């Protein structure tokens, strides 16, 4: 809280954090895409897709 | 294989700071890059914790900084760390760029790495300017007035760009809230362009003080340069702690403790010390349009270097004339800053015009002419013809 209840210290620090977390999200999306690029995506048939691929 | 090489995330750590093959001959001048990484982390963390107590309204900006010093616990430590840390940021960066100028690190195989560094230099200058304006003292308000008024010299569209930048008719409340939002964002662009800086270095690796190939003798990064970087890391915080706890206002200006007033000119107006050399170049041209263009040229001429060096040897280690004229440029840079903090007087006007000429003549005249002469001296000094 920064005090005894929800007050001026709380609102001012919540805006500083609302600015920061989106840039952390952008960093975890890259880690998300890096782990996908290992084996590639899946398909609705649930079987291997190595026999037919398109760019 | 080892888990540090097979994992998707650990393999990026292993390939960059653990198993990276480094030349065995690199000296302590190759330690400034790791220091710049610690400076960027220090500025981001102290800025975020200070931003929880800051207000960007033009009627509350100055008082919110005074609130941080007095009321916030350990708040003066954060503020003096952030203000002095930015001064040490430019100290290391100036030495980092002069190392590569001395050792020919801009040459052919690594032109892309050099070009990305110039972009980081431009962004860092903008970030420091925007944060200085957020204090809203007497030197930050009047410094912002002169800097943003130079865009009005652009033909046709010049006057409209200033109004769009100000958000009004002068430096007012819309400008100050504009600059704090940009001061939060630009450091994250720098962090993303630093990763592109390391990607372009990994293709060919680092250079060495001798200027020749380093593929014959390499040692891993971990436990050899991890502990050599730790030596300058501890020395870096020792000098910073001296300036933070025993002399926190030696690198500043006393006029920035007077709240911003648009009705009283603060006598001489100067920027921070690390922008002073470029401030003197702008004032040396008796023309607003031409003088403004020359100021960004001084950063863009660094891209001409890989093509005006006509030498077949990389670096200045074994070059007699190139070593002498290198320090002429270095001390010419220091004299330019002194003129930037001086008044417009009889001797100082011509001193800054000649020193401006030497700055540009070094890249375009001195380096091409000197490098061709030394090539012949190396040849005729050993061939029996």
């Amino acid at each position: 809280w920064g005090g005894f209840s929800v007050s001026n210290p709380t609102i001012q620090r919540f805006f500083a954090l609302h600015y920061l977390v989106p840039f952390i999200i952008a960093a975890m999306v890259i880690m998300h895409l890096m782990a996908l690029h290992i084996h590639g995506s899946s398909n609705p048939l649930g079987i291997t897709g190595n026999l037919d691929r398109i760019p | 294989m080892a888990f540090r090489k097979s994992n998707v995330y650990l393999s990026l750590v292993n390939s960059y700071i653990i198993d990276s093959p480094q030349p065995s001959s690199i000296n302590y001048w190759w330690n400034m890059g790791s220091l710049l990484g610690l400076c960027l982390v220090i500025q981001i963390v102290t800025g975020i914790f200070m931003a929880m107590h800051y207000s960007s309204n033009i009627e509350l900006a100055f008082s919110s900084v005074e609130h941080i010093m007095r009321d916030v616990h350990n708040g003066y430590i954060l503020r003096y760390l952030h203000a002095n840390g930015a001064s040490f940021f430019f100290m290391v960066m100036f030495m980092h760029m002069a190392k590569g100028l001395y050792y020919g690190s801009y040459r052919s195989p690594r032109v892309t790495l050099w070009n990305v560094g110039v972009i980081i230099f431009i962004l860092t200058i903008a970030t420091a300017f925007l944060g200085y304006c957020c204090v809203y003292g007497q030197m930050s308000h009047w410094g912002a007035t002169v800097i943003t008024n130079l865009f009005s010299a652009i033909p046709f569209v010049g006057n409209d760009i200033v109004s769009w930048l100000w958000g009004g008719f002068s430096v007012s409340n819309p400008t100050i809230q504009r600059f704090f939002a940009l001061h939060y964002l630009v450091p994250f662009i720098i962090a993303a362009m630093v990763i592109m800086h390391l990607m372009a270095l990994h293709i060919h690796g680092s250079s060495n003080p001798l200027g020749i190939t380093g593929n014959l003798d390499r040692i891993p990064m971990h436990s050899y340069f991890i502990f050599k970087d730790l030596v300058t890391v501890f020395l870096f915080m020792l000098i910073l702690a001296l300036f933070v706890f025993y002399s926190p206002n030696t690198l500043g200006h006393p006029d920035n403790y007077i709240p911003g007033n648009p009705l009283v000119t603060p006598a001489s107006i100067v920027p921070e010390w690390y922008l002073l050399p470029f401030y003197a170049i702008l004032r040396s041209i008796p023309d607003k349009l031409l003088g403004v263009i020359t100021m960004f040229a001084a950063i863009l001429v660094l891209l001409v270097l890989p093509f005006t060096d006509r030498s077949v040897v990389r670096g200045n280690t074994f070059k007699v004339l190139s070593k002498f004229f290198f320090f002429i440029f270095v001390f010419n840079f220091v004299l330019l800053g002194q003129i930037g903090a001086c008044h417009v007087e009889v001797p100082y006007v011509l001193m800054g015009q000649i020193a401006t000429f030497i700055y540009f003549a070094y890249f375009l005249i001195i380096v091409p002419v000197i490098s061709t002469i030394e090539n012949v001296l190396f040849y005729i000094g050993r061939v029996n013809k």
């Binding site: - | 502990f227 030596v231 020792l238 702690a241 025993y246 006029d255």
Partner: protein, 247 residues
């Protein structure tokens, strides 16, 4: 520019808080507040200093309670919405002599007396400039200068002419501790007090810098030994060349 419009440079005095191991003289801080209240407070403000910050530095908790209760502060309106007033408390700020800036310029021949909460940090010279300005009024202006009416002469002020007149005269304040109050003694005490107003963290900052430098200097020495130990094999390494036979 000329040295007249630059202003004479203040000399260097041996302040008791000068030095890496030195703190403020808290007896001069206590004496300096009395000079401010009886001489300075008629025309200057200290609006960045709260009453509570004086407790434990130069006054007791009960003393500051009686000091603040002599001023009237605005209160919340009553049940019918009419305005009210109340005596001060420890959480308030030291009030100024004027309601607005137009009132201040009207009482000072159109000149504005600046606030004195950061004046030590806002001038080139610090404590040496405030002391020299308060004790540097000559009885006569140098032969040749032409002062505008309503302005005084002081060599330490940039330009020469200053809108503030001499205000410190011998034996104008009666200190409680029996110290002879002279022009130099009062100018020295009020400057120490104003320095504490600008930097109230001075005492605790210097104590933290001693711990930081001692710890950081040990680490720098320890890391040199560790680096040389890990590099011992590479530093002492030998190479021999024996040319191979042609094949």
């Amino acid at each position: 520019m000329t040295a007249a419009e630059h202003g004479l440079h203040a000399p260097a005095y041996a302040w008791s808080h000068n030095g890496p191991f030195e703190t403020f003289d808290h007896a001069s801080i206590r004496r300096g507040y009395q000079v401010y209240r009886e001489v300075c407070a008629a025309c200057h403000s200290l609006d960045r200093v709260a009453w509570r910050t004086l407790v434990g530095v130069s006054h007791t908790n009960e003393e500051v309670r009686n000091m603040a209760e002599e001023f009237e502060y605005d209160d919340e309106p009553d049940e019918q919405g009419n305005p009210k007033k109340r005596p001060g408390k420890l959480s308030d700020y030291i009030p100024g002599p004027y309601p607005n800036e137009q009132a201040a310029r009207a009482a000072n021949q159109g000149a504005l007396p600046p606030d004195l909460s950061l004046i030590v940090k806002a001038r080139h010279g610090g404590c040496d400039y405030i002391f020299s300005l308060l004790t540097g009024y000559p009885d006569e202006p140098p032969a040749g200068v032409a002062l505008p009416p309503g302005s005084n002469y002081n060599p330490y002020f940039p330009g020469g002419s200053i809108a503030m007149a001499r205000v410190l005269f011998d034996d104008m304040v009666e200190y409680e501790d029996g110290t002879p109050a002279t022009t130099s003694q009062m100018a020295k005490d009020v400057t120490t007090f104003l320095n504490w107003c600008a930097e109230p963290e001075h005492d605790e900052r210097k104590r933290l810098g001693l711990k930081t430098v001692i710890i950081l200097s040990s680490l720098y020495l320890l890391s040199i030994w560790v680096k040389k130990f890990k590099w011992a094999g590479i530093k002492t390494r030998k190479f021999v060349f024996n040319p191979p036979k042609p094949r």
